Amino acid sequence: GKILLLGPERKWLRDFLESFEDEVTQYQDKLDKKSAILNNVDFIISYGYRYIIHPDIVERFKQRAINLHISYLPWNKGADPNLWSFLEDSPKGVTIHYIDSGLDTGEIIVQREVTYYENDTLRTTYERLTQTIEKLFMEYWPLIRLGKIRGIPQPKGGSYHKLKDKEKYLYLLTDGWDTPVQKLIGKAQ
């Protein structure tokens, strides 16, 4: 099969997907509805993709397009989920979900809670989320690749954030991504 990876290039993920004798193409720029990147694409995997996928593409690859989102949906849809999971003291984790119209609102395939520690920073928590979702994806990809799973509807509620929403809190990130998370718990409540 042919897998379209939307997001930055990741040799490990290419090699892993290519381990199942599938073809892998990568693209990280804005994707038009009629782009030839999509021809003969069996499955779309979005991971770090920084653009909204057109509803026409969504409906075309309905049930064949998943997104790796480093949040515990329905909480922290959209941008900067790791930061917001602390700013709003919400559940923390990673979710693999089918892609639908709207940002991070599709059916949930699998989730995993990720805990944190007293001396965690945004960097160490992000890295733990990354390792977890990448581990979680490899665990269930053999099952997902064969259409062996169906998702459950994402419960309404949770939360959603835009990139600009964090501007009012950047002053708390004294050490950038090396800022301890403890100084950020519930600061947005």
Ligand SMILES: CC(=O)N[C@H]1[C@@H](OP(=O)(O)OP(=O)(O)OC[C@H]2O[C@@H](n3ccc(=O)[nH]c3=O)[C@H](O)[C@@H]2O)O[C@@H](C)[C@H](NC=O)[C@@H]1O
């Ligand atoms: C378009 C958009 O707004 N977000 C993307 C995507 O962005 P992402 O690929 O995660 O890259 P990011 O900008 O977050 O940071 C880049 C580097 O900064 C360091 N870092 C950052 C934040 C932190 O809390 N701690 C850190 O240490 C770290 O090293 C990281 O490699 O996140 C998804 C959740 C979004 N939705 C998916 O469904 C979108 O797909």
